[PDB]
Amino acid sequence: AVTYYRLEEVAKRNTAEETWMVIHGRVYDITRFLSEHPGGEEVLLEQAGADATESFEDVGHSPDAREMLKQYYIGDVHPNDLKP
Ligand code: HEM
């Protein structure tokens, strides 16, 4: 039973205390990654709660970073929130 979030709840996690992001319709808690993030600490906080999809793809991220993504996954965006 995969879990769901809602953009709204996602959005509440705009801090360093707790960092969430949405990439390709999956939510993540990046909280712990920041320090590891080769491209920056500030870039991500710059988009907490946000759907950085467009952003992360516009910076080109590798398959390796993609794979890294799997460890910070917390769920997917609510279907009803999915934008089709
Ligand atoms: C969990 C989310 C993210 C993960 C796991 C991740 C991972 C990585 C990794 C592994 C690299 C180094 C080389 C590569 O694999 O391409 C990298 C570089 C970088 N990423 Fe991220 N990234 C994430 C989110 C973002 C976002 C949202 C942005 C922009 C808003 C961003 C901007 C950058 C920049 C600027 C660099 C390095 C400088 C450059 O290559 O231009 N990253 N990231």
Side-chain angles (χ1 to χ4, degrees):
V2 151
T3 303
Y4 298 60
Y5 290 78
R6 215 133 334 149
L7 291 195
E8 181 272 326
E9 334 142 324
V10 184
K12 298 158 309 213
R13 284 86 205 178
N14 50 208
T15 33
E17 279 305 335
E18 232 167 87
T19 313
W20 289 11
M21 204 145 44
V22 160
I23 298 147
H24 294 318
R26 287 117 154 238
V27 176
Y28 316 84
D29 179 20
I30 297 119
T31 304
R32 297 177 313 178
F33 184 58
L34 297 169
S35 290
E36 278 58 33
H37 194 221
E41 315 104 11
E42 312 90 342
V43 79
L44 310 183
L45 283 171
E46 252 238 50
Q47 325 207 252
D51 168 322
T53 290
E54 324 100 273
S55 113
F56 168 101
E57 286 280 283
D58 247 280
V59 160
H61 283 70
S62 89
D64 314 19
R66 273 154 214 271
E67 274 132 87
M68 298 221 25
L69 216 37
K70 314 248 171 154
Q71 282 66 21
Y72 309 90
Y73 176 82
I74 59 174
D76 334 348
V77 191
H78 205 279
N80 298 289
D81 276 37
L82 287 201
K83 51 227 167 208

